[PDB]
Nucleic acid binder design. Structure first.
Length: 117
DNA sequence: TTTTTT
């Protein structure tokens, strides 16, 4: 029930995927139209590409460094034309152990993008 | 306390 990065699409209220940490920034406060929240940004991806991860509130800076994680049902929002991934409440992040997920130095950087008419 | 920024 989990899709890959090279097969993900924006505007989805549900996105399940397994990837590795490519980067991680400390948690900072942002100013929205609904007030102030605490979020952070961390780069992840797998052998199918790469997608920017956006943690929300407690997930902010709560993640680890290049380690095997498992993204859950979150969502995707297209910023500036490029798809993006986030992690909030219905999303549960946790370390996952497999047969050895691809390293960050061997993880593609292909940016997923839906097809336009 | 799903909004973020290029």
């Amino acid at each position: 029930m989990e899709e890959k990065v090279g097969n993900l699409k924006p505007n989805m209220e549900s996105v399940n995927v397994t990837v590795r940490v490519l980067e991680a920034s400390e948690a900072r406060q942002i100013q929205t139209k609904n007030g102030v929240r605490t979020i952070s940004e961390a780069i992840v991806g797998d052998e199918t590409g790469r997608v920017k991860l956006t943690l929300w509130g407690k997930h902010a800076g709560s993640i680890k460094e290049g380690q095997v994680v498992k993204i859950e049902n979150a969502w995707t929002t297209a910023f500036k034309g490029q798809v993006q991934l986030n992690a909030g409440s219905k999303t549960k992040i946790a370390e996952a152990s497999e047969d050895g997920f691809p390293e960050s130095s061997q993880i593609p950087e292909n940016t997923p993008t839906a097809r336009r008419r």
